[PDB]
Structures are given as structure tokens and as C-alpha cells.
Ligand binder design. Sequence first.
Ligand SMILES: CC(C)CCC[C@@H](C)[C@H]1CC[C@H]2[C@@H]3CC=C4C[C@@H](OC(=O)CCC(=O)O)CC[C@]4(C)[C@H]3CC[C@]12C
Ligand SMILES: CC(C)CCC[C@@H](C)[C@H]1CC[C@H]2[C@@H]3CC=C4C[C@@H](OC(=O)CCC(=O)O)CC[C@]4(C)[C@H]3CC[C@]12C
Ligand SMILES: CC(C)CCC[C@@H](C)[C@H]1CC[C@H]2[C@@H]3CC=C4C[C@@H](OC(=O)CCC(=O)O)CC[C@]4(C)[C@H]3CC[C@]12C
Ligand SMILES: CC(C)CCC[C@@H](C)[C@H]1CC[C@H]2[C@@H]3CC=C4C[C@@H](O)CC[C@]4(C)[C@H]3CC[C@]12C
Ligand SMILES: CC(C)CCC[C@@H](C)[C@H]1CC[C@H]2[C@@H]3CC=C4C[C@@H](O)CC[C@]4(C)[C@H]3CC[C@]12C
Ligand SMILES: CC(C)CCC[C@@H](C)[C@H]1CC[C@H]2[C@@H]3CC=C4C[C@@H](O)CC[C@]4(C)[C@H]3CC[C@]12C
Ligand SMILES: [Ca+2]
Lengths: 48, 48, 48, 49, 156, 138, 144, 144, 97
Amino acid sequence: AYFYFVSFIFLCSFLMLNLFVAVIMDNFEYLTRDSSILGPHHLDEYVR
Amino acid sequence: LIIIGSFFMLNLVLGVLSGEFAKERERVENRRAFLKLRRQQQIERELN
Amino acid sequence: QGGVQGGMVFSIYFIVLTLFGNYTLLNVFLAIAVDNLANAQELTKDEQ
Amino acid sequence: LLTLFTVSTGEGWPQVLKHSVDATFENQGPSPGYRMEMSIFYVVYFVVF
Amino acid sequence: VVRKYAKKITEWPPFEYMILATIIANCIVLALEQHLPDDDKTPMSERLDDTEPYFIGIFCFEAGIKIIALGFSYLRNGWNVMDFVVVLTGILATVGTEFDLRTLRAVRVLRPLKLVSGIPSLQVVLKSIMKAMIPLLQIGLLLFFAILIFAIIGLE
Amino acid sequence: ENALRVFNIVFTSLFSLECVLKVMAFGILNYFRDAWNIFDFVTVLGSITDILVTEFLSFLRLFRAARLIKLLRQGYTIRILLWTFVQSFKALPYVCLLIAMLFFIYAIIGMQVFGNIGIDVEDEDSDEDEFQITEHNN
Amino acid sequence: FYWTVLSLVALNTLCVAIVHYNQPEWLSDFLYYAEFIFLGLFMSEMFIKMYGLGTRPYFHSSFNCFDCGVIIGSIFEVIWAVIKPGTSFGISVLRALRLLRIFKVTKYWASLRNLVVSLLNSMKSIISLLFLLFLFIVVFALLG
Amino acid sequence: SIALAAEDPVQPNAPRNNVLRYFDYVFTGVFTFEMVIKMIDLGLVLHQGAYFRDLWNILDFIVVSGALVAFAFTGNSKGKDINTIKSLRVLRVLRPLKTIKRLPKLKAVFDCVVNSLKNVFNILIVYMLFMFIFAVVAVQLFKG
Amino acid sequence: YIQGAASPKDMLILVDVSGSVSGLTLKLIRTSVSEMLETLSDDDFVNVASFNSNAQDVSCFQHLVQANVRNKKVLKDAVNNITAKGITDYKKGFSFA
Ligand SMILES: CC(C)CCC[C@@H](C)[C@H]1CC[C@H]2[C@@H]3CC=C4C[C@@H](OC(=O)CCC(=O)O)CC[C@]4(C)[C@H]3CC[C@]12C
Ligand SMILES: CC(C)CCC[C@@H](C)[C@H]1CC[C@H]2[C@@H]3CC=C4C[C@@H](OC(=O)CCC(=O)O)CC[C@]4(C)[C@H]3CC[C@]12C
Ligand SMILES: CC(C)CCC[C@@H](C)[C@H]1CC[C@H]2[C@@H]3CC=C4C[C@@H](OC(=O)CCC(=O)O)CC[C@]4(C)[C@H]3CC[C@]12C
Ligand SMILES: CC(C)CCC[C@@H](C)[C@H]1CC[C@H]2[C@@H]3CC=C4C[C@@H](O)CC[C@]4(C)[C@H]3CC[C@]12C
Ligand SMILES: CC(C)CCC[C@@H](C)[C@H]1CC[C@H]2[C@@H]3CC=C4C[C@@H](O)CC[C@]4(C)[C@H]3CC[C@]12C
Ligand SMILES: CC(C)CCC[C@@H](C)[C@H]1CC[C@H]2[C@@H]3CC=C4C[C@@H](O)CC[C@]4(C)[C@H]3CC[C@]12C
Ligand SMILES: [Ca+2]
């Protein structure tokens, strides 16, 4: 039970963290966007 | 409730903060401090 | 402060403390880690 | 290391802190609030890890 | 709100250091207080409590110097506004007791924050922290909506 | 309780008119090509269902509780931020699968090793910290 | 010399880890004397560098100053034990931080050294950040 | 994998476990057949295409070998040694991991996780050294 | 045993009822005072007083009463109905005792 729970907390936190960075770093262009420079988010304003 | 409320919001908070920190690094005043740091290190290597 | 009958307005002290404290700690320590590690990566790449 | 790992995950450390401040001497029982300066150990531990 | 310019005298470096010292002393005095149940006081409580006139007088004096020198650009700075309300609430409780004024003592907790106003270096660092959490407010709006929706569902 | 229930009948009527009004204006087919329109249509159909049964449980009216989401479209920066992150979770399905396997492997190991522990044990001592393997947690 | 003193630190790090609640009496006697032996060797290692490299070159080195602090701290503990028996802080374990110098032989030294270089560069900012964080705790503590 | 999830832990002699036991024979049989042909197509000896060279092949080898050995102990006498056979039955939980190698995109995600461990390994060693120092100090303070 | 272990007493219990004894300490004080009253014979005289800032008698008794089975009941009932509020003044409670 010592190894069962101690390893789980490490592995669960590590695998969840890799999920977070994968989702974050997929949208990293949007998160570091600047309103001055053109971006894909702006182009939807052209459509309406 | 836990997945949406706690794990999904934590993902956005890390995502938004990380994007802000990337933009802050490339600020003109912040870049100049790093350029001073790089030059000061180059002197130390040659001086040694 | 009374009980459930009269002291329910005092939960705001605890809500504000844990809500602000949770993300203030994240902001302070993650900014320290990101900025200093990003400096080290650029500083290492430049010397190579 | 197992006790500190439990504190790192954040669960149950208030009880570990209570036992730490109440400790008196080797092979002797606890006394409430004996060593209240041992709180510095857990505050410094949280800052680092 | 002054008599225009008439021998207006400004500050000199030891002045703000004396203000800093009195703020630190006030913080220590606040940290030395013990609260006991049901209208019970410790012997040191009276000695600590009688020091309040001195601190409030010093703070009122420095606020007066700044307000006459600047001319009431005093309230332009956000830090001075926080200083002004600290002085105002103190005088109401300290001078006169006819109204219920035990609640106004709670405003004294903000006095340690005057360290940030006094030391300009801390202001720059404090600006950095608040700047990053401006985007995070939009996350809080998502969080509140999520809590509201799940509260309705839990209510049903 | 009756007054609250009466207001439900008033709203579910008006919310049914919007669907009727849009369908005629947009057309049978074009209207049914927008995700919100079906979401709106299933919501009105679910709520109207329960009302007739009462005179002739309504947890599917909590779909109506989801109507508040429509207010998000007015706030732009929230809508883009919420939508982009949701799309990213769809583009990373196998990363979620790896977490599911970790729970699977650690669940099977737990059943075989720690499954036999008894839970019926209870005593006046009731050292709750001592015994955390109970009817709910096992 | 560099590898030999480093191997001594590994022995000293091992010695302070053996201690447990009921250790046999022979173990306590061995460890009691071994601390003085290790302390003596590292103080001598201090003096050899001091005379070998000169007092000014030795002290100006950042690494050697850290060795001074643990050496001075170790002396403080032993005298403290006699005056007030019952309390031991194990200050000698801080000598184990010298094991991080092993990273020099690997390719990973540049990444690790640069991180410490950048941390020391912004030491003023980090200290101010912790102070402001401490101030808000005090305000909330006073409000409570 | 689904069979391992249906099994009743509380009742060793449950009717469900009796039925599922027959299924365990078939699944091992399939894994035995694929093992030998993989040894036949490749080579056991280390000729740079060795079957034992690939790490997952050892993982496949362990699952099938444990199942076969568990049968041998049960074969002689059903309940002569319940402890070790119960331990060997636990190795079946490695069956889901056999999916990672075969699925291309699941292997790719797995390599990314291992890649992240490599980057943070150097800091992880520093983390444990610092945590070791705190543990030794904590022992001296609160031992006994 | 109590009869043979000592001589008749003139006991005056002085109970502190300032604010700081509020909560658990008050329950322990009342239980302790009752248990002390149980160790008194009819040859013993007892009176219970209390003081936060001015001393007063807890019950109707004003001077000293022998520890009957009924005087003791009156004192116990009076003790079980005291509340903690004020600032301790030892020089006014001891001057009363
Ligand atoms: C984010 C970080 C930088 C802030 C952490 C706050 C610390 C500066 C505080 C939190 C707990 C405090 C400790 C809590 C308890 C005590 C015991 C107390 O010392 C006594 O002997 C008092 C006797 C008693 O209280 O019975 C006062 C100092 C000390 C070590 C305090 C010192 C200041 C500490 C470490
Ligand atoms: C830097 C690292 C690699 C150092 C080596 C690890 C040590 C910190 C650990 C590893 C195993 C530990 C040991 C595991 C178990 C025991 C048995 C324990 O003895 C008893 O339980 C009873 C002794 C008796 O009654 O005689 C004493 C401590 C000791 C040696 C431990 C001391 C600390 C040890 C050596
Ligand atoms: C999520 C993925 C991995 C698939 C889900 C797997 C398990 C969560 C499911 C699959 C088959 C299910 C089992 C199918 C049939 C039964 C019998 C059913 O009947 C009984 O009460 C026991 C039989 C008896 O009393 O004799 C109890 C639930 C159980 C064990 C089910 C428990 C949940 C199981 C193991
Ligand atoms: C895997 C090992 C290292 C520990 C497991 C990680 C989890 C359980 C631990 C490690 C780091 C911890 C968090 C680190 C950051 C903070 C600071 C503040 O925001 C709230 C506390 C909080 C949230 C800690 C709570 C629990 C925490 C998330
Ligand atoms: C950063 C690395 C070097 C970690 C080493 C620092 C740690 C181990 C030190 C720093 C401050 C220290 C504390 C300072 C003061 C006291 C009070 C004393 O009566 C008991 C020990 C105790 C509670 C110390 C325990 C050890 C301690 C927490
Ligand atoms: C091959 C995969 C699908 C494994 C699935 C096996 C599952 C679905 C089957 C196999 C054996 C089956 C069990 C066999 C034994 C019993 C006891 C019987 O009195 C009731 C049904 C019950 C409880 C069956 C439930 C379903 C069951 C568990
Ligand atoms: Ca008192």
C-alpha cells in the first residue's frame, strides 16, 4: 500500500500535467496574441 | 463538477498566465535587462 | 458568530482569502519559475 | 520522506504540524504548545518544495 | 485647497524615513495585541491601546504636510487615498465615542499596507503582480457561471 | 411553490413561440442546420412534455437551465477562449486515453490486492481515521 | 584532491542518514566520534586551501564561503549540545549540497549553472515578491 | 482487460469467477501462440534483430510466463501454496499495456511523456537532494 | 475516610468568573466546585463566592453555612448558573474571602 498510493499520486499528477501543457501549447498562438498584429481571431469579424 | 470546475479552470489559468509571461519577456524594458545579463556573462567567461 | 442563523455573512472572509490566495500564490511563484527558466534557456543557447 | 511527501501533497499536514509543536522529549508524551517555533520548519518547507 | 503659493515647504529625506519607522512601530503594536473572550483585557492591552493617539497624530501631521504642499494633487495618487481613509476612520473612532465605533477599529488592519506606499520600490513590484491577473478576471467570469449553473442543478 | 410553477408555464409558452416563429421564418431545413436551434428545440420539446403529463420527474427541464449559456455569445473574449480550449481537447484524444489506462491498471491492482479487506467492522471505538475502507470507500 | 574530498562528503552524507530512533549503542558511539573526524578533515581542508591559495583568493570564491558557513555552523551545534542537551539540528547535512558539483562532468552543467546565475541576478525582485506576499498575510491575519 | 474488471475480489468462489476462470485459459493460449511465432520469425539470440532485444517483448514474455507458471503450481495441488499463486495472478494487469506498442498514435503519446521525464530529470535529482536534506533535519528534530 | 483524615474546616471557594474562563474552563470549574462540595461533612462550613471585577456571593447565603445535604444543593444549583464576563480583580476577591 505504500508503493501503491505513493506512485499513483506521482503518476496521476505527472500525466495530468502533460495533458495540461499539451492543450495549452496547442493554443499558444492565441494565448500570446496581440490585438495590433493580425490573427485568425480577427478574421471572423470580416465574415459578419 | 470536479472536472469542469477544478481541473478545466486550472487549465485555463495556467494557459492564460503562461501566455502573459511570454509577452512580458519580450517587452522592450525586459529585453534590455536580459541583454545586459548576457553581456555581463560573456565578460566573466573571457576574464576567467 | 451566532451560527448558521446569524453568522453566514462571515464566510466571505474565508471565500476571499482562499480564492485570492490560491491564484496569488500561483501568479507569484509561476512568474518566478517561468522568467528565470526562460532566461536560462536563452542564456544557454546563446553561449552554445 | 513519507511524512514530508504527505505534506507536499498538502493533505493532513495541519495534524503533522500539531504533533510537531507538541513534542517535548524522546520517549516522552506530548504537551500542547510546547515548541511553537517548529512552525518555521513547515513554513520554510512549503516555500521551497 | 491652499493659499496658492505662500512659503510652502517640502519634504527632506529623513522625513519619509521617520514615517517608515512609525509605521513599523504601529505594525509591531498591532502584532502585540491579544484578544480575550467576553470583555476581558490583558494588562498590556491598556498600555498598547493608549499609544494610538501618538500614531494617529503623526499620521495626521504627515498627511497635513503633504496636503498643504501638494494642495489637495494629494488625492490623485491611489496610495495617498488609502492613507487618507486610514487617517479619517481613525480620528472618528479615537475622538468621540457616542456612535458605535468598535467596528471602525477594524480599519487599522490596512496600516501595514502603508509600507508599500512609502517604499517606491515595492510599488513597482506590486504593479507587476496585478498586471498579470487582469486577464484572469475573464476566467473568474467563467468560474462564476459554472458555479451558478451547478448550484441551480444541485438546488433541484 | 404553485406561483413558481405557474411562471414556468408562462415561459415555456413564450420559448415555444420563438421556435415556432424562427422555423417559419428560417424554413424547416435551414433552421435545423444550426446547433443552437436543435439545442433550443430539444429544450422546448422536453419542457412541454412534462407539463401535459402532470395534468393527463422533470429533470430534463434542467436543459432549460443551460439556456444561460446563450448569454455567453454576447461576450466575445470569453466565447473564443472557451471554444478554443474545447477544440484542443478534441484534437488530443489519445492523451486522455493514457490517463484512462493509468486508472484502469491501478484499479485492477487494487481489487486483487486490497479487495478482500472487510468493511462490516464497526465498534464503539469508532477511530474514523483508522478505518477509511467503508461501504462508500472500498 | 577534487574527487577525494568529494568522496568524503558522500561518507559524511551517509553517516547522518543512518541515525534512527533506536540505534544500537555501538552505532551511536561510532557516529559520535565520526562527526569529529569528518569535522576535523573539512576544517583542515579549509586551512589547506586558505594557505595554499591565499586568504584573499580563497574567501572571494563563492563556493569556499559556503564551506565556511557549514564549518562554522557545525562548531556552533557541538557547543550548543553541551550547553543545552536535547536539541540537535543536524547542520552538517548541508555539506551534502556539494554533491551538486558532480553535474560539471556531465553536459547538464550549463543549463543548471545558468538557472542559478539568473536567480542570483534577480534576487532583489524575488525578495520583494516574498515580502509583498508576506505583507498580505499579515493584513489578513490582523483582519482575522 | 474486460475480464479482469468483472472478477469478484470479495468472493474467491463466486460463480462469476468460476466462469471467468475458463476465459483465462483461452487468453493465455492466444498469447502463447503469438509469443512462439514471434520467437520463430525473429531470433532469441542477440543478432541485432533479437526478440528479447525489444523492451515490450520482455513485457509480453512476463505476462505469458507468469500465467503458465501459475498453472504449474495449481496443477500439482490446487491449494498447496495459495500465497504465491495469488501473487502471480496479479501480473495479468499488464495486458492493457500491450496495446501501447501496437497502436501507433498511443505509442507516440507515450514517447512524449517519456520525453518530458528526460527534460526534468536533472531538476528531479536536485529536488530529491533538497528533500533528503529536509528529511535528515526533520529526523534530528522529531526522532522519538 | 474524609472524617478520619483531617479536622473540620471553614472553606470558602473563590471562583473566577472573568471573561477569559468562558467555554470549557467554566464547565470544568463548575464540575470541580461541585466535586469539592461533595467532600464536605456536616461539621464543615462552606460558602461559595465569585468575582469578575466586584466580588459577590453566588447564592442567597451571605456568611457561611454548614454543609448539609441541602445547603450544598443550593450552592451547587447557584454554581451551575454562573456566566463569565469581566476583567479579573484579585485584590477585590481576596479582600472579600
Ligand atoms: C509566505 C511566508 C514568507 C510567510 C510565513 C509566515 C511566517 C513568517 C510565520 C508563520 C508562522 C509563524 C510562527 C508561529 C509560531 C511561533 C512560535 C512563537 O514563539 C514562541 O515561543 C511563542 C510561545 C507561544 O506562542 O506559546 C512565535 C514565533 C513563531 C516561530 C512564529 C514566527 C513567524 C512564523 C514562522
Ligand atoms: C544517500 C543514500 C543512498 C544513503 C543510503 C540510504 C539510507 C538513507 C537508508 C537506506 C535504508 C535505511 C535503513 C533501513 C532500515 C534500518 C533498520 C533500523 O533498525 C531497526 O529497525 C531496529 C534496529 C535494532 O533494534 O537493532 C535502523 C535504521 C536502518 C538501518 C535504516 C537507516 C537508513 C538507511 C540506511
Ligand atoms: C469502462 C470500460 C472499461 C468497461 C466497463 C467495465 C466494467 C465497469 C463493467 C463491465 C461488465 C460489468 C459487470 C457485468 C455483470 C455484472 C453482474 C451483476 O450481477 C450481480 O449482482 C452479480 C451476479 C450474481 O449475483 O450472481 C453485478 C455487476 C457486474 C459484476 C458488472 C460490474 C461492472 C462491469 C465489470
Ligand atoms: C506529485 C507530488 C510532487 C505532489 C502532487 C501534486 C499536488 C497534489 C500538490 C503539489 C503542489 C501542490 C500545490 C502547489 C501550489 C499551490 C499553491 C496555491 O496555489 C495553493 C496550494 C497549492 C495548490 C498546492 C496544493 C497541492 C499540490 C497541487
Ligand atoms: C534550504 C535548505 C538548506 C534547508 C535547510 C534549512 C532548514 C533545515 C532550517 C532553516 C530554519 C531552521 C529552523 C530555525 C529555528 C528553529 C528553532 C529551534 O528551536 C528548533 C529548530 C528550528 C525549527 C529550525 C529547524 C531547521 C530549519 C527549518
Ligand atoms: C469476454 C468479455 C466480454 C468478458 C465479459 C464476461 C461477462 C460479460 C460475463 C462473463 C461471465 C458472466 C457471469 C457468469 C456468472 C454469473 C452468475 C450467474 O448466476 C448470473 C450471471 C453472471 C453474473 C454472469 C454475468 C456476466 C458475465 C460476467
Ligand atoms: Ca481573566
